[PDB]
Write a protein that binds this ligand. Structure first.
Ligand SMILES: NC(=O)c1ccc[n+]([C@@H]2O[C@H](COP(=O)([O-])OP(=O)(O)OC[C@H]3O[C@@H](n4cnc5c(N)ncnc54)[C@H](OP(=O)(O)O)[C@@H]3O)[C@@H](O)[C@H]2O)c1
Length: 316
C-alpha cells in the first residue's frame, strides 16, 4: 500500500486524511495538531463546517513548529452551494484560504452539484421549507473553479456528491480546460458505490470515500439505523486480523484505490485510525464487505430533493 495516489493534475494526494465535519471548534485545533504529529498529511475541510479558522490555527502552528513543510501537506476545502455564482467563487475561496491561514489549497471541490440563492443563510428557505435554488448551472460554476487554478489559489479542482451523469456533464463541457481531479462521495460497506467508482476511475478521476465509519455522530441518526461499527460481521473480520472495526472500515476503501477521510476529535482514535498500513484484507474479505451493500446514505441532502441538480434520484 503506497501512501499517496497520483492525480490527473500531476500532484500526489495522501490516501488517508482527517475529516472535520462536526469537529467542535474548541476541539478541532488539538485534533489536527495530534493528527499531523502522528502522521496525517491530508486534512478535509469545508466552509459550511464553520470550523476552518480553528483548523487553520493547527496547520499554522505545525508549519511554524517545522513539524511539517507546506509542500508535504494536502489541504482540501469545498465551495458551498450559496457561492455557485461566477462573481462569488473567488471570494469564497479566498475566505477559506484566509481562515485556513494558507496561500493556496491543494484541492478545492464543488461541495454539492446544487446551487442555492446567495446570502447569509447556508440553506435559504422559501416560506414553505424548500431550498431556494440558484439559476447558475454546474458548467458555469466549473469555469469559475478553473479560474482559481489559473490564478494560483488552488492546485487542483474537483467535485463532491456528483452522480455519474453529472460527472459526464463536466467531462463533456464545451471548452473544458481542467478535468475534475477527484469526486468525493459517501462510501462504506452499506453504500458500496461500485458503478460510480468504476466510472470515475475509468476516467482518471480519483474517488474519495466520506463517512467511511458510517458517521455515528451524524445529527439525524435514529437508533433503528444500521451501525457499521457495531455490525458483528465486520467485528468478526477485524477480530481475525487483530485490528479494530474502524481500522478494517478504513483499510477497505484503501484497497479499492480510494482516498478515505475518517473523522475523529479523540486523540487515541486519531492515532489508531492511522495504523492501517500494516495489514491486508484478503480478496475474500473485500468481496464479503462489498456484499453488505444496502444503498444506505448518511448524507441524502433531504431538503433539496426537488432541486433540478439533486444527485440521488439517478441510479448512480
Ligand atoms: N463531501 C461531503 O458532502 C461530505 C459529507 C460527509 C462527510 N464528509 C467528510 O468526511 C469526513 C468523515 O465522515 P463523517 O464525519 O461523516 O463520519 P465518519 O468518519 O464515518 O465517522 C466519524 C465518527 O466516528 C467516530 N470515530 C472515529 N474513529 C473512531 C474509532 N476508531 N472508533 C470508534 N469511533 C470512531 C467519531 O467519534 P469522535 O470524533 O468522537 O472520536 C465520529 O463520531 C467528514 O468529517 C468530512 O470531512 C464530506
Amino acid at each position: 500500500m503506497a501512501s499517496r495516489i497520483l492525480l490527473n493534475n500531476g500532484a500526489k494526494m495522501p490516501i488517508l486524511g482527517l475529516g472535520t465535519w462536526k469537529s467542535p471548534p474548541g476541539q478541532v485545533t488539538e485534533a489536527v495538531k495530534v493528527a499531523i504529529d502522528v502522521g496525517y498529511r491530508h486534512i478535509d475541510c469545508a466552509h459550511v463546517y464553520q470550523n476552518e479558522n480553528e483548523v487553520g490555527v493547527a496547520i499554522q502552528e505545525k508549519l511554524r513548529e517545522q513539524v511539517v513543510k507546506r509542500e508535504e501537506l494536502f489541504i482540501v476545502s469545498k465551495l458551498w452551494c450559496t457561492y455557485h455564482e461566477k462573481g462569488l467563487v473567488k471570494g469564497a475561496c479566498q475566505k477559506t484560504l484566509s481562515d485556513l491561514k494558507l496561500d493556496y489549497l491543494d484541492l478545492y471541490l464543488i461541495h454539492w452539484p446544487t446551487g442555492f440563492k446567495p446570502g447569509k443563510e447556508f440553506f435559504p428557505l422559501d416560506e414553505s421549507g424548500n431550498v431556494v435554488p440558484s439559476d447558475t448551472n454546474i458548467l458555469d460554476t466549473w469555469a469559475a473553479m478553473e479560474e482559481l487554478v489559473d490564478e494560483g489559489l488552488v492546485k487542483a479542482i474537483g467535485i463532491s456528491n456528483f452522480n455519474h451523469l453529472q460527472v459526464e456533464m463536466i467531462l463533456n463541457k464545451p471548452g473544458l480546460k481542467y478535468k475534475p481531479a477527484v469526486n468525493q462521495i459517501e462510501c462504506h460497506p452499506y453504500l458500496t458505490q461500485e458503478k460510480l467508482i468504476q466510472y470515475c476511475q475509468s476516467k482518471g478521476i480519483v474517488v474519495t470515500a466520506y463517512s467511511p465509519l458510517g458517521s455515528p455522530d451524524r445529527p439525524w441518526a435514529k437508533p433503528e439505523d444500521p451501525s457499521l461499527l457495531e455490525d458483528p460481521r465486520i467485528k468478526a473480520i477485524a477480530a481475525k486480523h487483530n485490528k479494530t472495526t474502524a481500522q478494517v472500515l478504513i483499510r477497505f476503501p484503501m484497497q479499492r484505490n480510494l482516498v478515505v477521510i475518517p473523522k475523529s476529535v479523540t486523540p487515541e482514535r486519531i492515532a489508531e485510525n492511522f495504523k492501517v498500513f500494516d495489514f491486508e484484507l484478503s480478496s475474500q474479505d473485500m468481496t464479503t464487505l462489498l456484499s453488505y451493500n444496502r444503498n444506505w446514505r448518511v448524507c441524502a441532502l433531504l431538503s433539496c430533493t426537488s432541486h433540478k441538480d439533486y444527485p440521488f434520484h439517478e441510479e448512480f
